[PDB]
């Protein structure tokens, strides 16, 4: 399990684009289960939408991407902050995205990603986003890990 502090040392993302609060499950080269809490106290809700708070679907995808990248990175180098700073995880494609249920404040947005296939630095992950056991979204993504600036 990894907490926000650990996440912050692996991912370069910061406020307000770090969308993973905690990692509950992690199997190298296999899968990951992480989540992000959804609360009203988030700036996005001011505009999406007034008097009707709905967590953006694209951000649910961004959350799945971040989880997948965290998976791809730790599988290769484990918990290594120094190496994390020397790498970039670039998302090339995203496909098969489907939104079934709206995520709102109060929900625990859980990400479930598994490694579909990986060769070299190219990693393809897929899975779902869930709230209390039900699939609220699904998607497949492909990332490329490379050397930073």
């Amino acid at each position: 399990q990894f907490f926000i502090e650990h996440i912050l040392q692996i991912l370069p993302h910061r406020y307000p684009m770090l969308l993973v609060d905690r990692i509950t499950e992690l199997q190298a080269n296999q899968k990951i289960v992480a989540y992000k809490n959804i609360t009203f106290n988030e700036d996005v809700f001011n505009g999406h939408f007034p008097n009707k708070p709905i967590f953006p679907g694209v951000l649910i995808v961004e959350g799945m991407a971040q989880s997948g990248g965290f998976l791809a990175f730790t599988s290769l180098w484990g918990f290594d902050p120094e190496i994390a700073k020397t790498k970039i995880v670039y998302f090339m494609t995203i496909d098969k995205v489907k939104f079934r249920i709206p995520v709102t404040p109060g929900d625990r947005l859980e990400y479930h990603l598994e490694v579909l296939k990986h060769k070299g630095m190219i990693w393809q992950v897929g899975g779902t986003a869930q709230v209390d056991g039900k699939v609220v979204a699904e998607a497949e993504l492909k990332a490329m890990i490379a050397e930073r600036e």
Copy 2:
């Protein structure tokens, strides 16, 4: 239950000071149980503290005051959005608060409040704030509803 939509119709608090996401239990003139999710994606963490996100203890208290306010608006006027939209809430007193465990991103901050006393618009309640079944804080407070 009362979801955020409902909460917004009763409490006048708005971003970034509305600190209750959902109401799980309510019993007029008795008690209320609600909660707020804590995530890194909240502006308060930029300054509290950099590299060490800790949900402010005073905001935990504010969240309990708000939970008690909801119970007060409802015990008073039931769920009546139009009477509510004309009021605001003022903090009167806060006492006997203790912080046991720090609340952080990933935590589900559950509020437990019971009414200790009340007269007219002045309400006194007390209880705790809990994370995964454990008490992270205790407090008592008195607020006033006003036109």
Copy 3:
């Protein structure tokens, strides 16, 4: 229906608001066919504080979002024309997103131009596909299916 709309008009049709209204101006609009709009990218946006420190890159998912909002404007006005009163009773919902591909990173100073075309539409169901471009170059491409839903 005109073919050019400014932020004043976008605000009357779309429900999105700060910081999630990612379309600044509509330059071309063909009912039931296509729309060409754009969003200016500037460092002065909160998103860059966290994506990323010292290296501002506009989130690929937001590029898609801007594409969806552009398509939503096209879908709505393709049916009711510029009608604020009705627009305020409808909300465009996207059900799917496919074949998204990011080719070039978008950065402050860029003029992110959205190019969406109507692949299929029946009733309130709209399927759109297209690209996001900067200086005539494709920076991303996507396909999305949306639903014109009732706000209440």
Copy 4:
């Protein structure tokens, strides 16, 4: 020293925007008392939600400002003015008692903190005092906070 400005507060207190609620220190006696203040203006984010059409500086933030006042007094009383030592320290609230709000604080108010040390041992400080506007008391509070090395 007895007077300190925002430059000095920033070097001592760990708090940062939008949670640094002390703008200036007008006087302080080591291990004894500190007088400081925070300017309240409409141009502050909390006002968007507290409350629309009626800007009222949150009561719990006045308490927060008093605590930070105490923290500054605590830190300088232990290590004097030492930024390098202070940069890795954090401050945890332990308890809050007998607080009472008497007058709403609004934009244009100069919120003045008055804290006195009621007891302190090691990293644990118990301060007590008031928040004043135009020489009048708007709030009272007693609180215990702990200075801790960040780990």
Copy 5:
């Protein structure tokens, strides 16, 4: 009235967060002058980038506050405290001149705007004055605005 609080300023000026830069009106003489102020606190977003580790209220925002004060003066002089009519007008500023900055403004400062009508002909208002902190002239500037119909 002679003194207007944030509540009143909100009903007269269209400006909102984070561009409403006047917190209270302490003096107001129809067609002659106005004295108002805005508190300066660290808890303001602008200090995040102007400048990190050195909070200095932007000079262009001091002029803005001065302009806002001039506008209130002009509007109230024509129709008094009338929120209803206020919503149908705009105070378009055409020129700014002779502005000099003497002392930087920092968190903890009380920025007091001192403006006076230099000329009023038809829908054109010319105002000038200074920004002061604790009796000291911090900035001066002249501004010209046009009263028009809100669209």
Copy 6:
């Protein structure tokens, strides 16, 4: 010293940060003489929340700020070329603003182009004057004097 600089470069020269860095890219630069730069204007900027609701207008005073920052970039690079270690120790202070005229309101979707020339300069004191332009038209005019000083 080149004549085209991007945000990553501007970030390494000017001390300004969000939400007060109002220059996104430099398109032209002549040491000690002139500079042409620009800032993209988008609805997705916090300042529009209050200036004004339902009618986004980029504040005129912020246009002068942008002109000053472009000037600042000119001054720094003229003085020390592209030098991040030395620039990092400085800040910029406004001294005077003059002859500012606001001819056309700037709104989301506009590309605010700054055109400044060095009127006078000696040491850390720089005096510049020029215009702010949108699609070839003069949107604003201004003259200003600024000083570069150690953050001490």
